[PDB]
């Protein structure tokens, strides 16, 4: 299974003109695409190797159709700030995310369509690509006019048709990259909190993609209890990590063992403290 | 690549 | 909702004398064009403009100038006339971004002559 | 960016088919096709638009409209020709511009005269 993702950001300036608005690509968890309005190249920029390829008409299309949104955005903030009867002089934020998911037969599983008004659910895209979900009643004024109009057959065209395209494109272009499962370089530290307790922290660096499950077991059975994940951070080299510490009494170390399993890995892994 | 801008807006 | 309203529906000039060419849409719409239609050649665009304040030279810019004062009025100026200006000329406008598919709502056309 | 409307003048029976052609060519992928109707009168009246994604064949009424995107071409035939059906149609194609802002050009036009 793969996915391809792009995420507009837009966000009003009011007093500072032209809003600024942000389009970034990723396949699976790596970014290979971005736009910036405010950057002086007002073009869409390469953020990956196997993108670099494409030629330019490519990159005008890309440029010409990312701008042609933004403008659209530009003027939906203005919609949305009259249907919510909000300030003139206030920074809001239209977010939208859209793309599709291949299965291993590398046929379409199914596309994604969502937008948001300062970070929450204001209309989204059914699985069905023919019918959209409103959040509110401003939202149910934008999914009436998008339902007269027929815009849902416009981004089904897209998610069944030429995302599936290039995801493909994509997947092929940069396999070396992208098909390719760094396995999780694991290790595990001590760190004595008094003289009768001790923090065994079980890590795992430069692993991709960034799915990843770290367990404590306790003498073969599953210990949670005084367990402390942190949010999967990204190495920024294309490779993720994430460490898992629990909380032992001084001189039971033995018992606890650290269990990390990744997609890279054949076999899940098993570490203890010496 | 990028989908075509909306057609209508909200 | 009017539409597009343009004027005058005819006029004749001296080849030098000067006028402006006048239109005005009451749908709130973002862009307006002044084309230039002629036996033979197509829907020729002199000058657009993409909202109020800003205006920008279309096909044949050459001869002509534009004021986008305000949203609703897009004007179009001759300074010296030529027996080459002598055209229809059609004023029309777009929604703009918020509708990116909107066609084209022409005027009724200003049919000019300029003899010598 | 390009429309041809290969046509310059097609007179046709009275009660009888009759197809106007316009091959279109632009690099866009999400782009707009129109028809615009200009009977004698003189005004330029919209008549239909087609999205660059959805399905070649509309019949409404006399009027059909065939979206061959392979070909490039999005013909309009007028099936048991109306006298008042005498007019030139104009074939045009909107694509996004470098600014972001959807502008489209027109074909130079087909002039259907409908005998009795």
């Known amino acids: 299974s793969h996915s391809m993702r792009y995420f507009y950001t837009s966000v009003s300036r009011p007093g500072r003109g032209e809003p600024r608005f942000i389009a970034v690509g990723y396949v699976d968890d790596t970014q290979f695409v971005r736009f910036d309005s405010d950057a002086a190249s007002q073009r869409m920029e390469p953020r990956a190797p196997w993108i670099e390829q494409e030629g330019p008409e490519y990159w005008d299309q890309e440029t010409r159709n990312v701008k042609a949104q933004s403008q659209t955005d530009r003027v939906d903030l203005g919609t949305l700030r009259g249907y919510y009867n909000q300030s003139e002089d206030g920074s809001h934020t239209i977010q939208i995310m859209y793309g599709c998911d291949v299965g291993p037969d590398g046929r379409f599983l199914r596309g994604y369509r969502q937008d948001a008004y300062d970070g929450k659910d204001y209309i989204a895209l059914n699985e069905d690509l023919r019918s959209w979900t409103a959040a509110d009643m401003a939202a149910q004024i934008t999914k009436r006019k998008w339902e007269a109009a027929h815009a849902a057959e416009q981004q089904r065209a897209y998610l069944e048709g030429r995302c599936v395209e290039w995801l493909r494109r994509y997947l092929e272009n940069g396999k070396e990259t992208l098909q390719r499962t760094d396995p999780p370089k694991t290790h595990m530290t001590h760190h004595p909190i008094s003289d009768h307790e001790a923090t065994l922290r079980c890590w795992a660096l430069g692993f991709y993609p960034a799915e990843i499950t770290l367990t404590w077991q306790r003498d073969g059975e599953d210990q949670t209890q005084d367990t402390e994940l942190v949010e999967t951070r990204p190495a920024g080299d294309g490779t993720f990590q994430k460490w898992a510490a629990v909380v032992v009494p001084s001189g039971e170390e033995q018992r606890y063992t650290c269990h990390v399993q990744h997609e890279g890995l054949p076999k899940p892994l098993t570490l203890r403290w010496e | 690549v990028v989908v075509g801008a909306d057609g209508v807006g909200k | 909702n009017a539409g597009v309203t343009q004027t005058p529906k005819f006029r004749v000039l001296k080849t030098g004398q000067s006028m402006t060419l006048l239109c005005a849409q009451d749908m709130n719409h973002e862009y307006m064009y002044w084309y230039r239609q002629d036996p033979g050649m197509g829907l020729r665009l002199i000058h657009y403009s993409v909202g109020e304040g800003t205006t920008a030279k279309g096909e044949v810019p050459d001869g002509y100038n534009v004021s986008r004062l305000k949203k609703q009025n897009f004007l179009l100026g001759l300074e010296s006339a030529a027996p080459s200006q002598t055209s229809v000329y059609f004023c029309?406008?777009?929604?703009?971004?918020?509708?990116?598919?909107?066609?084209?709502?022409f005027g009724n056309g200003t049919r000019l002559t300029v003899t010598e | 960016q390009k429309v041809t409307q290969a046509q310059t003048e097609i007179s046709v029976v009275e009660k009888e088919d009759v197809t106007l052609d316009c091959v279109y060519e632009t690099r866009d992928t999400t782009y707009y096709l129109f028809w615009y109707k200009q009977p004698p009168s003189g005004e330029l009246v919209f008549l239909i638009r087609?999205?660059?994604?959805?399905?070649q064949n509309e019949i409404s009424g006399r009027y059909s409209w065939n979206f061959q995107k392979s070909t490039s071409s999005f013909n309009f035939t007028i099936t048991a020709s109306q006298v008042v059906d005498s007019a030139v149609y104009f074939c045009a194609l909107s694509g996004p511009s470098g600014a972001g802002s959807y502008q489209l050009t027109f074909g130079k036009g087909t002039k259907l005269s409908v005998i009795p």
């Open positions: 087609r999205n660059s994604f959805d399905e």
């Open positions: 029309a406008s777009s929604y703009g971004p918020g509708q990116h598919n909107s066609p084209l709502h």
